Amino acid sequence: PLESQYQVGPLLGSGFGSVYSGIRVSDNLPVAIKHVEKDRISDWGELPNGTRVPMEVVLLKKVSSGFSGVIRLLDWFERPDSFVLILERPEPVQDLFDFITERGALQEELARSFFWQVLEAVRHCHNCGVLHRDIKDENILIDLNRGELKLIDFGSGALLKDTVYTDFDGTRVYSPPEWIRYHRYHGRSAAVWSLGILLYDMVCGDIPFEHDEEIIRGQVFFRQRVSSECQHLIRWCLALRPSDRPTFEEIQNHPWMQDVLLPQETAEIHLH
Numbered sequence: 049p050l051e052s053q054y055q056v057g058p059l060l061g062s063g064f065g066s067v068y069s070g071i072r073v074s075d076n077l078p079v080a081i082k083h084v085e086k087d088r089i090s091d092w093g094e095l096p097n098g099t100r101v102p103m104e105v106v107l108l109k110k111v112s113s114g115f116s117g118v119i120r121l122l123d124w125f126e127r128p129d130s131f132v133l134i135l136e137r138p139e140p141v142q143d144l145f146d147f148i149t150e151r152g153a154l155q156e157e158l159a160r161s162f163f164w165q166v167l168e169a170v171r172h173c174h175n176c177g178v179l180h181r182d183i184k185d186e187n188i189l190i191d192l193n194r195g196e197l198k199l200i201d202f203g204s205g206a207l208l209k210d211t212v213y214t215d216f217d218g219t220r221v222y223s224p225p226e227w228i229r230y231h232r233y234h235g236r237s238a239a240v241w242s243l244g245i246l247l248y249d250m251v252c253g254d255i256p257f258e259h260d261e262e263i264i265r266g267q268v269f270f271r272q273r274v275s276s277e278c279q280h281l282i283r284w285c286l287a288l289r290p291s292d293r294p295t296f297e298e299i300q301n302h303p304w305m306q307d308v309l310l311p312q313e314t315a316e317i318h319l320h
């Protein structure tokens with residue numbers, strides 16, 4: 049019933065598998081259709097009702113309930129050598145990496161709005177028991193009309209727990225120093241680090257650290273003009289000691305995070 053209920057369109061991307069544009073024939077709902085080969089899945093779990101699935105599906109199902117800044121799983125399918133996921137697809141949309149590539153460093157007011165919606169989405173995941181572990185500009189989509197951000201690739205994710213993680217499959221340049229040095233981290237505080245990398249990316253147009261030695265050394269240089277407030281939040285998230293990082297709450301009460309724009313106003317001003 050998969051080949052019948054969706055009409056396939058162009059390839060959107062690959063790297064996590066291959067994702068195509070698609071339409072639900074049922075009712076013209078735009079969708080993204082994502083194929084993952086069994087052979088390349090390292091990491092499996094089980095749905096409450098109990099079959100053996102890719103962790104990504106466990107995670108997506110735990111966070112796709114209700115609204116939020118996560119692209120929702122609408123349906124999934126097993127095939128003999130692959131799994132296939134059907135996801136929301138906002139229309140039109142651009143990923144943040146390509147947005148930043150095209151437009152360079154974001155004005156603060158726009159970064160503040162975007163970063164805020166990222167925090168709301170990640171709180172939402174942490175709440176649903178899910179840790180993303182690969183937060184970064186290419187895992188974030190922009191619905192250009194509504195100004196709403198949406199998180200996407202759960203393939204390196206995990207169940208959130210309070211004990212140490214000794215595996216990491218995400219992106220190195222976004223990984224915290226404790227992972228580089230000890231091969232251990234905790235979820236929240238690792239995620240905060242990656243948030244601080246992301247915020248630097250948004251306001252400087254590029255990631256701050258490229259090599260292991262710079263991650264570990266953790267000194268941040270600004271190549272672009274950034275308010276003292278923005279710089280201080282960033283250095284805070286990128287503190288070397290995990291316990292010196294802010295919690296989500298403290299990131300959202302920081303002075304740089306005041307007077308955020310709603311998504312709609314953000315798009316009027318900045319995206320049309």
Ligand SMILES: O=C1c2c(O)ccc(O)c2C(=O)c2c(NCCOCCO)ccc(NCCOCCO)c21
Nearest residue numbers: 060061062067080135136137138141142143146200
């Ligand atoms: O993974 C999605 C995606 C998804 O996983 C679930 C729903 C979606 O709507 C998408 C998605 O729209 C998507 C991409 N969309 C076109 C936006 O172009 C990038 C901006 O220049 C462009 C790329 C993309 N995925 C991978 C990003 O990098 C791939 C490099 O070729 C996606």
